Design a protein around this ligand. Sequence first.
Ligand code: C74
Length: 254
Amino acid sequence: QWALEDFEIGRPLGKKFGNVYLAREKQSKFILALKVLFKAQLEKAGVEHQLRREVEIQSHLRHPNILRLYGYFHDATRVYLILEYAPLGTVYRELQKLSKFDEQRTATYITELANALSYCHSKRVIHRDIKPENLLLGSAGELKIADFGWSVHACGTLDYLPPEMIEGRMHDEKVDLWSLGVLCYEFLVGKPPFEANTYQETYKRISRVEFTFPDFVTEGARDLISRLLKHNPSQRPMLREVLEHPWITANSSK
Ligand SMILES: O=[S+](=O)Oc1cccc(-c2c[nH]c3ncnc(N4CCOCC4)c23)c1
């Protein structure tokens, strides 16, 4: 039902796995994002099925703060994904430019994130790879979760991975609550709470939950973060109370 013939390619949006390009559905004049994946990478990495997994998960997943996947197709040498175009780019790019985020922006992003995750959890879908470069911004500054590569229904940088996952133990939906704490930290500080020059160092800093707060962090923020960043998953608060946390309720937008 789809072919490269149907699309006019444009500006390179970014990104190994394969590049992402701005494109236009010729008949519809609809502008979207097109990621080209070379099956060569699919072979050597054995991600031939992982794609077939996520492409089913995301394709029938509809939420304002989740980047939509409209469809997919393949030729001889490449695989193409037709994704929603996020005009305001990534949050990672935003964070680079502004170094740090204010509490309104942070609580707003965290709010939009939680809402999208609850929905995912409703369909019993866990994301795990919630990272600034996987968070896009829509036309209205809308936060939009992207990339469901490791999304399932129950190795690079370890910064956003929870203790139970890096130790090999069993991981539930509380994984995303860990990441949510990591982001709120990085959104406020500009750096992840467990950063290191070493995979091995970050491993220990994560596993022992060793994070320190700079002075400009509000106690209202120090609370939520330290509540989301707990070694025992069962102690991580529910997504509902996150959205009901006073610091969130105060600084988040409407
Ligand atoms: O793993 S795949 O889903 O590929 C991805 C992973 C994350 C976002 C992504 C999307 C989706 N829509 C987009 N509009 C504008 N830039 C995008 N970017 C930022 C710059 O880098 C390349 C993607 C982008 C594609």
